[PDB]
Point group: D2
Chain length 331, copies 4
């Protein structure tokens, strides 16, 4: 018989399920950044990639496979068929349409909704017990959409939300203070992006409230213009998009961080997008970022942050906006 059979005696033909499997749907720059970050943090024993562009998908898959010598994830697979995604613990959706010239925002949102209508049922068929982590924008709306289509309980449908926005905030805060972002604490809540809410009262280093040291923190009156930090959380994303065309690395790392908490059941707290009806004064079925405890069953718990009247009003405004958009969408 063969060289293989001369070299190797096989006892065991038992099938084996993947035990720590992650799927990434959508292998654009964001999806691949998520994939490489996950691979290099050894979060999965199997990584599955899905796209509709078959050549891109296969080529990306093969490129990762060629680096297997340098990795500790023994199985990397891909396909347009969702059977490759079977038995995933965690499925990350980074699939999206490209805005065309002369296309409205609303049309693009609806094109992304329609992509989700095809993706989510297929994911659910093959991984009924998975957690869904939604990265695709508009992320708060598409997390709601994924929830409604999947039929999953709300603990298993999580939007990356303001995890990245909060990471940018801690980055910017660290630059101003000369401290590593790990030691700089501050929370951006609500909607990902423009309408995000910096919670000034929780901003601290070593448990020291910046707001109590500096009462003008977060106001227009501030000599030091600390509001500019939050403004830059928003503008820095626009800046990266202008300079290189898109963002990928930061979101990839942030998603790997959330994945770590889920896959290893860490019960760390992250600002992610969750079904917030009945809390913080919100009365409609919408997803907004608040600090959530993440582990193996998704969101098990959330932190009830004390907001100023102004902060709360901004969240309710966001919720009204999201409800309005949600009802003018089609499904």
């Amino acid at each position: 018989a063969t060289l293989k059979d001369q070299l190797i005696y096989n006892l065991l033909k038992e099938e084996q399920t993947p035990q720590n499997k992650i799927t990434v749907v959508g292998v654009g720059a964001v999806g691949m950044a998520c994939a490489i970050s996950i691979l290099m943090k050894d979060l999965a024993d199997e990584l599955a990639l899905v796209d509709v562009i078959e050549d891109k998908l296969k080529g990306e898959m093969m490129d990762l496979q060629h680096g297997s010598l340098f990795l500790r994830t023994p199985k990397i697979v891909s396909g347009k068929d969702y059977n490759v995604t079977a038995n995933s613990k965690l499925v990350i959706i980074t699939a999206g349409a490209r805005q065309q010239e002369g296309e409205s925002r609303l049309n693009l949102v609806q094109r992304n909704v329609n992509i989700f209508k095809f993706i989510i049922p297929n994911v659910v068929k093959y991984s009924p017990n998975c957690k869904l982590l939604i990265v695709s924008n508009p992320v708060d709306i598409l997390t709601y959409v994924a929830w409604k289509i999947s039929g999953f309980p709300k603990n298993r449908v999580i939007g990356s939300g303001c995890n990245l926005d909060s990471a940018r905030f801690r980055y910017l805060m660290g630059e101003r203070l000369g401290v590593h972002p790990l030691s700089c604490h501050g929370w951006v809540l609500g909607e990902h992006g423009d309408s995000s809410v910096p919670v000034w009262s929780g901003m601290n280093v070593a448990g020291v409230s910046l707001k109590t040291l500096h009462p003008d923190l977060g106001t227009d009156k501030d000599k030091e213009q600390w509001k500019e930090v939050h403004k830059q959380v928003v503008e820095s994303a626009y800046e990266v998009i202008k300079l290189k065309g898109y963002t990928s690395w930061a979101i990839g790392l942030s998603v790997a961080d959330l994945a770590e908490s889920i896959m290893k059941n860490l019960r760390r707290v992250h600002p992610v997008s969750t079904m917030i009806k009945g809390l913080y004064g919100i009365k409609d079925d919408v997803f907004l970022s608040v600090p959530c405890i993440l582990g193996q069953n998704g969101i098990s718990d959330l932190v009830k942050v004390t907001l100023t009247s102004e902060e709360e009003a901004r969240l309710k405004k966001s919720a009204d906006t999201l409800w309005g958009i949600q009802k003018e969408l089609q499904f």
Copy 2:
């Protein structure tokens, strides 16, 4: 005074040199793959990025910076000016021209040589004691060019060479055997790419020579066509380029692996491109991949692999080709 000054008492204003600094020149897909792989393996305390496209460079830099919370490399910098590269231990060149329609190979090679004529003197000015790791293709020729321009001793000028080719080989070998590539041993030497030489005699698992088990290994007569494995080492690269347009992930991981050996002085053995005159029968100043011991002073030693007459002839043919191309190039 300021909130910073209220929060933080500064004692120490001493300047501080970077102690474990790496530079990547050329932030295309390869350069960025190298950067992310290095960042996620904590190989540097400072990463510097250089390109000629200022917007791309800045946007990439900012995108990595936004993920700082998730990293243990506290300083990421960039610029077109090489003063940002000062005091690097290791400088990785991934800078390259794009082939235009109707452009010869030779013209492209010369365009890459001319890029090196601008890069290498600038690198050397600011990091005279660095190791140079050349990734740009044609890698064997451009490693020779970097050596000649830099004036560095040959131990400090290293071409990524067949490190990636050998990684692909061990990947493919592992697929055939059902074993992790880490446990599958085999060496591809000589030129990166088409003319690479698989050394059949060193192919083993657990110290068991495949050639001794299967004497037809590497021949045309082989029922099992193990030559196809090496053919696929070549074709798989062309395949990835066809499918996704380029390769990035595998090379990025392979470069991070070489960087690990250098930065941590591991004295591991890797198939990299080194000045091979006077060895394996070669009589001209050319760079080819052989197994080299890598650490803090670059290539300190190399392994003398016993080659068949045929293997040796293929290397000498390669050396003659490289010498011929080298003399028809301009510097």
Copy 3:
């Protein structure tokens, strides 16, 4: 209500089964070396400790728990009762007695057998699907004992075996060559310790057979005395026992390496102790180290090393020794 309930809204009131649980039985120096190594490679989401000495057990557990901030293993538990071990994927046995005044080694072996008669049934009750990794000495005999008491198929009963011995060999080989042990290839097979067999023909760097370069490799007359390398594999262990009283760190790291391959399903090849009847000429039910493919279902495959007549005779001699001891033991 409580501060917890004021801070935290609970979504989900669920039990939570451990997904990547490892148990260490025996928290002496070897057990705790295994524990810390596993904790610092993030191989488990839950670690369970068992001993008969309650105070030591509890104190060790608490000491690890106090380092939780610095680890990514969210649940560390301990008890005398094996219910704390329930649903382990991997159970590592490092439990044993200490040789008393006037006690033969064989008397001690029987006391260790009797320890296993208490441990193994308890482990099996609470983790019927686990892999068993036996570390306690005499390791080859006690792996057989664990197999017989457990009733487990042979893929799921693994002795740490010569993984450590082979690591020592590659260390010593690296000292002689000035190369990292990772790049120095060589296998020690058979029994852990004194009777271990160095396979000279597999010794290589970069696929270059040392035996072919140096035909006297492994002979007594060798100018360079390379047999001393294997002798030192044995004597170095006795040396550490003499100088420090025991060994712990190297075995801890070796066991973490095996655990990595199992928990991450890597299908790497390791020289571990497996039920070898019917292979390598062995005709009795014994455990000896040969190169095995390790993954999530334990030992899936064996590499068939080509041995000299003498190497094979040494394995069969070992098998006859183990069979003789196994028959004169009481169970």
Copy 4:
């Protein structure tokens, strides 16, 4: 010539200075816990061990060396002579005596002082530019002693201090809240151990002050007895000492955490023991733990925590205690 010379061509005949060297003085349980933690986080390219007990020292060194295959620290050395420590970036002192029958704690403190009188001059001769990290107890006093004997500026003399105490606090807080210690924020300052000060006002999750939610936090009358958390920070250490005889693992991990910040220049904030005269109302030359920014030049900056009158009084009391002990010690 030799098999080495047949296998390997030497390019470069150079000495090689260590670039990222760490020394551990005192290879008891705490020293070796520090060593293994540092080795498994790849913080050093060379580790040097020192003790006065030669056999134990050599045996421990050899045991680590046998695990080299599984590590990425290529050089591990040991000796009684401090020439093995030359050119260390970081030197960690874990050396100490054991309390004898009829011996006061103060008598023991003086014996530990006398140990430092021998150690520190020797460390300084061979690594005049190192940072000193003092772990030996009484840690605050012995950090002062190391400072006085060394003549080093205060940025380069660091006591492990309350980094461990704060880790215990966050562990216990996490047990009460059902959240990972990483997401539970809270500071223990002042002296390591009994007299440590919990700063109630900094206790938070997600920037939410527990003190503001629960005003009785830190009072004796508290319904929920949150003072018990701090009491347990102290008692849990006594508990581990009572149950196991000593503590090692948590301190090992805490020291590796400090070492990480220094070796990688992270500028994270840690509660470590620093020369605090002129701050927090302290008027004598003593070392107490406050939140310090740690990097490659040791302590670069201090965070100025807003303390209650009572918290500040407790620090000053500690300073008066330390000053009194320091004056009645002989050197």
